[PDB]
Structure 1
Amino acid sequence: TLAVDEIIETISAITPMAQKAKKYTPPAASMQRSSNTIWMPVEQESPTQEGWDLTDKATGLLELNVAVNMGEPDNDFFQLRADDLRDETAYRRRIQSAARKLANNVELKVANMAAEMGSLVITSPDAIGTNTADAWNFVADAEEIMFSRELNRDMGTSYFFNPQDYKKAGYDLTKRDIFGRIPEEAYRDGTIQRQVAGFDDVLRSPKLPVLTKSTATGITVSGAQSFKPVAWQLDNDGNKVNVDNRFATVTLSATTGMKRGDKISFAGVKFLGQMAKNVLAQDATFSVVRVVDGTHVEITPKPVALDDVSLSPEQRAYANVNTSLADAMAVNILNVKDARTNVFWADDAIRIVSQPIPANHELFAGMKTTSFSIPDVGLNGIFATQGDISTLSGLCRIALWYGVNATRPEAIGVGLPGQTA
């Protein structure tokens, strides 16, 4: 029996992080030769000396840089058998569902990248519904750490809750036994507020990831290590290859139980006020980026110690940690229990680099290619159809090329409630 053209709509997804992420499209002709990677400079910090006589104390100039690249296309290859009734009944809506799925995948990659590269970690030993106003406390902790670290927030901030914690916040607001304007808003609608504790956008995201617990324990630094901020270094042939500033490889006793996205913090290392270089009261928190080898890990916030003696003054001007590793300090893993993550960031920390797929060129003759416009997310890909006569079929492919980059991992953050046991 045939159907009656009245689609039953079942899915309605939203892409807040994807729509709020900035999108960048560097020149394709240059990017193709540069191998899908472009380097951007970082804000320059200068040293300062006190005294009258400064002979042979003249410092140089040091400017650091980061690199942004792209992954692989996200496709929707599907075939169309000619001898089937569905051939025209369903392919259009398959195209539409492909567009929706591509947007959802873009959002998922954004959320996962943010949650796995977020250096700043705010941990609570109890759930969001334990005390009163502890949801506001959770948001205000992120605001206060980003304020104390002197991180730039000109473009704006954002705090994405998972739906369970958002509901807990709303419940805490509504159980106040009083009704002004915020409690009545939270009673009628589920919202708490559009702006809370200094953030200019506090949203609820339905597809934030869950950071599974790490079984790692008894891990200690193997050998004193010092990390120096440099922009280029000489290779074997003598060419000056650039260095990415958002990565540092450390050597530990054993990387058993670690994984991409684990949040750690060594013993004794405290944060610094970036610009003022004033010691904070909060432990320096890092996020492991990749577990290379079996005794090495790669953490994203490079731990440049202020008291490092082997540092030139210009390099020391980029210090963000009050001390260096000492071969004996223990590393504490901040995520000790399974919990969905709430993700906060500065709006300029996450970007989406995009490139076109020039399949409209005359080289692709016999295949018809057009531009595909992804909704919600501001992205364009290609939509190509070709006809195969061996199988008496028509191949359809919706390709789309992009890459999610975190230019400032020290600006992204992660909130973990119930980090007990």
Structure 2
Amino acid sequence: NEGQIVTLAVDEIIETISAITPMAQKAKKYTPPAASMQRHSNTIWMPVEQHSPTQEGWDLTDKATGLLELNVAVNMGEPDNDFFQLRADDLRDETAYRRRIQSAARKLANNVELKVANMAAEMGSLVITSPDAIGTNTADAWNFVADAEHIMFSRELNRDMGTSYFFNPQDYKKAGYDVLRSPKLPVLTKSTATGITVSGAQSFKPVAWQLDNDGNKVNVDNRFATVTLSATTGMKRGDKISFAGVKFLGQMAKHVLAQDATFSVVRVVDGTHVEITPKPVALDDVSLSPEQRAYANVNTSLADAMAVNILNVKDARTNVFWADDAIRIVSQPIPANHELFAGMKTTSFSIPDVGLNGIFATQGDISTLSGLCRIALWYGVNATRPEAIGVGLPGQ
């Protein structure tokens, strides 16, 4: 063994996590600007931009400056980690030793997938439902991919390669067989609410800056917005809803689509308020500036006494899809000091294939005549753009 141990451990971890994390790829990396950070925590804003049709002419005098930018938050929790004791018969030879560290790495890598897979099904906003099972038979059985293509094309929203679809394993066989399996995809559940309405007519705006209590200006996160209700019994986060008169618009030409608008609920507050996504910015109001109108998705105001209806009417396992760069993974080197305290050999490491970073450490314990071993990965994940994440269901 000869004190080499850390080299074999990082060799297993890097190789293993790169192999077994398929759904953590197919999403886009990001970083701090200079890796300089050292505090216990930090908060990052990051930008998003809506594309614009190309100007034609020999030379130009207009629209070079662009339009109003927006930003979204991300925040990093305490690391996911594994913590275990090396009894010496696991340490006796290399091809035995790899077993332990590999099993820990596999136990850890599960959580990196489970977090993103759970997040997409709860937080997403496009919804498709047919009162049918999935099947290959052209008659009297439904096809999921056919509608999931059409609903994005008709919005103008997907304009790039890599649009991806995911199945749960007990459905992946029903459809025969870019498409992938995941075992980790959750179950929704049936909400109990009925007769729900808004009260008082309401409207909303994109905004770049507002005041903080000290008197400075901050960007305001634009993903969700508040709506107020006649009642709020019988609902939970990750449910799915629609407003009776309301329809979506395509991003470029701004025609109305055929089908009704869809919204997704992220918190319930004080028996009175709900936070929902995406923010329902409306066409056909004179109040908006020519910049502000460019972010309208919705045909009307949220009018008084609008009937609110549940779409998730009976419950089953999910299936999920997204356009490229809807979900991001963020990380830093861990704040730690090397070659300072004698009682704790430790090293940093990175996983370039997935953008994670982590730390390995070990210490000898008098209470068990054995080494203790710890591994931790620091990472944060969020949807940047709820408008682009979609969920299908088998019937109700």
Q: TM-score, normalised by structure 1?
A: 0.78
Confirm or deny: 8 A CA contact 1:103 1:375 kept in the other structure.
no
Gaps of 5+ in 1: 172-200
Q: 1:237 to 1:11 in 2, by over 3 A?
A: closer
Q: 1:278 to 1:88 in 2, by over 3 A?
A: same
Q: 1:133 to 1:349 in 2, by over 3 A?
A: farther
Q: 1:208 to 1:92 in 2, by over 3 A?
A: same
Q: 1:2 to 1:335 in 2, by over 3 A?
A: closer
Confirm or deny: 8 A CA contact 1:210 1:341 kept in the other structure.
yes
- Give deviations 1:118-162, integer Å, cap 9, x for gaps: 111111111113962787732121111111112144242000011
Confirm or deny: 8 A CA contact 1:102 1:374 kept in the other structure.
no
Tell me how far apart the structure 2 counterparts of residues 398 and 6 of structure 1 sit (CA, whole Å): 12
- Give deviations 1:352-400, integer Å, cap 9, x for gaps: 1112213353455531112456698553321111234466553321111
- Give deviations 1:213-247, integer Å, cap 9, x for gaps: 21222211122221110121123332111111211
Confirm or deny: 8 A CA contact 1:305 1:323 kept in the other structure.
yes
- Count of aligned pairs between the two proteins: 390
Confirm or deny: 8 A CA contact 1:273 1:320 kept in the other structure.
yes
* Aligned-partner SS, 1:54: coil
- Give deviations 1:261-317, integer Å, cap 9, x for gaps: 111111111101122221111111111122233221111201111123433332122
Confirm or deny: 8 A CA contact 1:116 1:260 kept in the other structure.
yes
Aligned to 1:175: none
Confirm or deny: 8 A CA contact 2:155 2:250 kept in the other structure.
yes
Tell me how far apart the structure 2 counterparts of residues 35 and 148 of structure 1 sit (CA, whole Å): 42
CA drift at 1:204: 2.1
Tell me how far apart the structure 2 counterparts of residues 65 and 6 of structure 1 sit (CA, whole Å): 38
Confirm or deny: 8 A CA contact 1:344 1:414 kept in the other structure.
yes
Confirm or deny: 8 A CA contact 1:100 1:374 kept in the other structure.
no
Confirm or deny: 8 A CA contact 1:44 1:62 kept in the other structure.
no
Tell me how far apart the structure 2 counterparts of residues 150 and 7 of structure 1 sit (CA, whole Å): 41
Tell me how far apart the structure 1 counterparts of residues 155 and 14 of structure 2 sit (CA, whole Å): 50
Q: 1:369 to 1:344 in 2, by over 3 A?
A: same
- Give deviations 1:82-103, integer Å, cap 9, x for gaps: 8999999987533221211221
CA drift at 1:29: 4.6
Confirm or deny: 8 A CA contact 2:189 2:314 kept in the other structure.
yes
Q: 1:85 to 1:217 in 2, by over 3 A?
A: same
CA drift at 1:49: 17
Paired residue for 2:197, among 215, 220, 226? 220
Tell me how far apart the structure 2 counterparts of residues 204 and 133 of structure 1 sit (CA, whole Å): 25
Paired residue for 1:23, among 22, 29, 34? 29
Confirm or deny: 8 A CA contact 2:17 2:106 kept in the other structure.
no
Q: CA RMSD in A?
A: 5.8
Tell me how far apart the structure 1 counterparts of residues 12 and 25 of structure 2 sit (CA, whole Å): 30
Give yes or no for the alignment of 1:286 onto 2:263: yes
CA drift at 1:414: 0.5
Aligned to 2:151: 145
Gaps of 5+ in 2: 1-6
**Identity of paired residues, percent?**
99
Q: 1:393 to 1:253 in 2, by over 3 A?
A: farther
Confirm or deny: 8 A CA contact 2:18 2:351 kept in the other structure.
no
Tell me how far apart the structure 1 counterparts of residues 143 and 251 of structure 2 sit (CA, whole Å): 24
Tell me how far apart the structure 1 counterparts of residues 357 and 59 of structure 2 sit (CA, whole Å): 60
Q: 1:364 to 1:113 in 2, by over 3 A?
A: farther
Q: 1:365 to 1:26 in 2, by over 3 A?
A: farther
Tell me how far apart the structure 2 counterparts of residues 391 and 58 of structure 1 sit (CA, whole Å): 69
- Give deviations 1:18-62, integer Å, cap 9, x for gaps: 132222232465655795332232225789999999999999952
Q: TM-score, normalised by structure 2?
A: 0.83
Confirm or deny: 8 A CA contact 2:199 2:304 kept in the other structure.
yes
Confirm or deny: 8 A CA contact 1:222 1:251 kept in the other structure.
yes
Q: Which moved more, 1:270-279 or 1:124-133?
A: 124-133
